Symmetry: C5
Subunit: 198 residues, 5 copies
């Protein structure tokens, strides 16, 4: 097997529309935001403009191959893969993807998709000039899949030294809520960005 | 039947261009706006910038399958489905869809499409600082189908605590307008004010 | 015949690239602008931002069908139809189409396409505060077809109550223009928008 | 032959990726800008916002047909034609095409493509309020083809210019440059368009 | 062989999704930025708006042909070629490509892709009024390929005389970075732009 063969098969056989549920268990999706820049902040309107790398990760065994005398990994266009329908609940602009839309696929079916995204959010900007800082919370989950089809889970350093802002702390936490309407839990990852102006 | 089969069949058979009229009766489409944010308001120009979840609902039985030992629901790209040509009559910008363009399809043919949309409207903004508040009305209906092909019908809580504004009341009511055929719309009245 | 069959045939046998000239006569295209909103006006730069419904209407016999026990009309994506290459000569932005790109087709081949468009124009804005008002002229014609392939012809009420402006008068008249580069003539419809600030 | 047949054949065969070199001669491409509007000008940043009709003409005999009892011309979507990869060297925004993307094709293979474009440029804006006016130069050439594959050539100045612009045109001149660099042994042609304009 | 044949074969065969690794050696990609304009600068937010020609060079032996009595080169749409997934690490806007998306392909398989790009970056703008000038660093590397799949390597004159700024110096150097999350090196080219206001 060479790269050409692996990518040929992936393209011919993968079903982007089909969630790779294994066994009627949820697909375990891991999400982790690496903040790169805070670009525009408005304490009056409570709106932030952020650049982050959305480290996403999951498994699709229909992509697997025997890497015996073969590449262990390939880069694959995401249009040829199933991808989690993740959305930020408090986003107020379309996610503007800044990077090549490729995912990294390992021979066992592990997939890493880490786009660089610029997006605006509605969050708490109060205290951004305070030393103690503002804390902006961003919630990311599947837009249409519930906890038994997709589970989301969590997993400062790549942040721009030239930003007008700096990061005090970032915490990532998972919410699971059960409602009266529905028998299923809804999962999201809440990312708390503690930042202030320099 | 597994998900792969269901999505394979939906894709191979579904005619997105073809309104799922059952019987020469209208397709019953339900619309309900869940406001999430009021972002920019202008009392001079009478223009608002709004973020809402457009809960849209209908039946397309050509999508149905026997869910005996099968999933009861799947997520389907809307490009593979027929979708109501709904438009906001008083919108003044393109609807900017913020979410994955998927719809949720139940084995009986029930379809739920609930995109998150950011859009600008021309409406009455007067009184927004008044604590009686402004009342902005948004009308949504089919752009090309009349009441016998498509009927629209109606059906605060998910609104952002961090908005500069707050919601006093939201009412949804249905109009039918004849200019030889009736065109229905849903009128959504958004009563809001600045904090 | 049901809707599915009609749309199937239209899709399989329409020729979006082919002007439905019948007979070596021009295709009679009717244009009529229904103004909905005047959004941004600048008397210094002489630029207006307008929202209108472009009631475009014309015939194409090759779409026709026998509506005996069949629907008399269907909604058809414009990508599956021939559409007049109409342009606004004094437009200074791309036409931003706000509505579903569908046209209404009658069984005799009559086609109605009425998109809602937001567009900026270069026109006379002088007198917009005067109560006599400004008069902005917009010219619409085929971009590449001359008067023997396409003829354009003409045909306040839907205008927004909440606009900063109001409409005094709208008149639509037809010109037949020859330019210097070219031997042939290009018809246009001139739309005069008399409006003022409230 | 009717329009349907001509457009059918053009589409089934025209090869948009393939420069219609005849004979190992360059394709003769004519360029001519007809200014329609000057929209925003900034003498500090030296940037202009311009609307122009880019009159573009060339031959492609693989499009030709015998117009005996047939239409002499047809309108053809440019996606079905080869089109010169012209770029403005000093452009600082994407060309925003305002018009239907059709070209006019004559039965002998002559092609006329004349889009209306709004674009921003980096040029000399100094003197725009002076009555002598500013002179903004715009250079247009093939982005990847050299002078032996593509040759560019020039063809009333205010004639289609907007009477409602804040600006007016004193003069427009079009001249042709040919440039050979030290990297590559090959000449690259451009058309330099000088726009002499001032505020009213 | 004529151009039509060469382009026909290139399009029928070449695989844009498949990195032209030859031997299990990295594809040697050369990057070199030719700055054309510095358009908008903000010493407060540390953000610059730049126009540059990204001279990108590499070899794809899959594209080769025998140029005996044939053209030595052709222009090919990049949608029909494999292209390095290069990204600017400190970019804060999408790359806006200003030129026709073609690459130049030589009969030996050498490929030159040199788009003109407008992009916004987060970099050090301090000292831009100082005569010593500011020094903005831009890092470009493969987004998903490591040093054994893709190596990047380096290689003022085309800069606009009408810019509000001028260039003191441009230096290009190569970094190789190995993280604690993956056993593998990721190369980038660091471009240092020394510029000041006139
Ligand atoms: N038959 C038909 C047909 C075809 C295309 C477009 C339209 C059209 N309907 C409306 C409209 C406005 C307000 C309320 N309801 C409908 N505006 O345009 C109608
Ligand atoms: C290339 O083609 C020809 C004949 O078609 C022959 O002259 C030449 O030696 C060939 N060379 C290659 C490297 O095969």
């Amino acid at each position: 097997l060479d790269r050409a063969d692996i990518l040929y098969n992936i393209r011919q056989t993968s079903r982007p529309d089909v969630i790779p549920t294994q066994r009627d268990r949820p697909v375990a999706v891991s999400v982790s935001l690496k903040f790169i820049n805070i670009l525009e902040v408005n304490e009056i309107t409570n709106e932030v403009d952020v650049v982050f790398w959305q480290q996403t990760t999951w498994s699709d065994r229909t992509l697997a191959w025997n890497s015996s005398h073969s590449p262990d990994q390939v880069s694959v266009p995401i249009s040829s893969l199933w991808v989690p329908d993740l959305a930020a609940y408090n986003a107020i602009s379309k996610p503007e993807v800044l990077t090549p839309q490729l995912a990294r696929v390992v021979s066992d079916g592990e997939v890493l998709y880490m786009p660089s995204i610029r997006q605006r959010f509605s969050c708490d900007v109060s205290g951004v000039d305070t030393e103690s800082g503002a804390t902006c919370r961003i919630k990311i989950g599947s837009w249409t899949h519930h906890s038994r089809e997709i589970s989301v889970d969590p997993t400062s350093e790549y942040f721009s030294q030239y930003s007008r802002f700096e990061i005090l702390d970032v915490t990532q936490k998972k919410n699971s809520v059960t409602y009266s309407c529905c028998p299923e839990a809804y999962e999201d990852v809440e990312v708390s960005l503690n930042f202030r102006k320099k």
